[PDB]
Amino acid sequence: VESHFDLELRAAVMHDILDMMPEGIKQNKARTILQHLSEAWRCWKANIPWKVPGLPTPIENMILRYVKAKADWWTNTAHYNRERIRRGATVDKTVCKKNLGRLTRLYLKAEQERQHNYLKDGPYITAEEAVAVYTTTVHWLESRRFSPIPFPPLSYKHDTKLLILALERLKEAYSVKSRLNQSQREELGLIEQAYDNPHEALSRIKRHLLTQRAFKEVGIEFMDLYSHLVPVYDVEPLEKITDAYLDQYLWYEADKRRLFPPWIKPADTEPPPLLVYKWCQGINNLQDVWETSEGECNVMLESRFEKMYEKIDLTLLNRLLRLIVDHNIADYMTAKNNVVINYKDMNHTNSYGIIRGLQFASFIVQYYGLVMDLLVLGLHRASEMAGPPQMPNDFLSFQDIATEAAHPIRLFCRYIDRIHIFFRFTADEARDLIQRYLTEHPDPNNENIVGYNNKKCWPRDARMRLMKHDVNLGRAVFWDIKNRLPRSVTTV
């Protein structure tokens, strides 16, 4: 195990102290240098730029070398534990926590390095394309005629109901059944004080959202999932109450003024049955979608951006939030999105990306995906898919058959991070599109069916029939949907 590696490292350090430049036998030092080396290794494990000063050149070099060796051993043990994470070789009971902690500290170091690269270097968001996307969102809002958020006054009627619902949600999330902690008691006490004095609570929330433009130290904790770790972030209790309040206010205002369109809307409906059922019926209720007599074709593309989190332009987020919501709440949201990150011993940096665990974060991701939807689908395509603001359409319906038959993109759906397109196209457009694709990225050696994401649902008569035509249509559609959006904001 790693104990043998640690013992060998300690023995090597002792030999280096005895052999690697001992400066003669003159009543030399003791294991205090080993304690300094251990402290330096812990400091590196904190992702800190500190070191172990107060030692000579060769002693410091040997200390750094032994620390790098122990670090390589720990990283190798962590890689072996991560390779055995899905199955875990009949996953044990005690090693799970150690492997999860090692992976957590590794990701903390990685996020610190990413924040340092974003801060020192200038990995911007394509400022020309960013201004273009801002102008596009401006035109989209002007076409939709969606009014911005009137930041919560104190004399609103349904504000007490919203605050009570927020307190109920926060209490249902905090304590389920006989659960408490050192700070959870503070959260329950704050919820009780809010339920007692709702006017004082609303005044305090208004004072925080209108004046407080900062936040306290927010912690992180990784959920012990098998495949994909789900991190959960913890924040201050009063900050959490204000978070829930302005979040619920934003939700009510958006549902009242229809800020969110239906395509980007996992929303008020049974999520699995309604999505799959309306999807299949729209694929079935299309304008003769199953007709393939005239050489027509259909393409269905499913993807996940992997760019609906930290990979965000914070200044662009503040600009869009000021474009759609008043300046105070938008500034407070932009401030809370990059407040602080604290590990068990480390202190991760901020101003790198959105913290998804903070409350009132769902409004941002669905509005951040809304700009990406305006970019990928376009302006006229979205305007036809939705309908006019005076008389919009259903979740997958058009105003007339011409609105669907004009453009190629027929059906469009979006998850919290997933995206699903279904577009029909004629044979002339197919030939032109394959011509463009081969002109951009040809496949002369017939290496176009090598890497193709296929399923295992009866792969003899139901899998994708890998022919010369369809295989290339898929790749070229995917490339076309890697050209609309910029490769720096998000990719597929």
Partner: peptide, 13 residues
């Protein structure tokens, strides 16, 4: 080695 090299190669706090 030396009296001064003994004090030179010393680990500080």
């Amino acid at each position: 080695m030396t009296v001064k090299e003994q004090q030179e190669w010393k680990i500080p706090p």
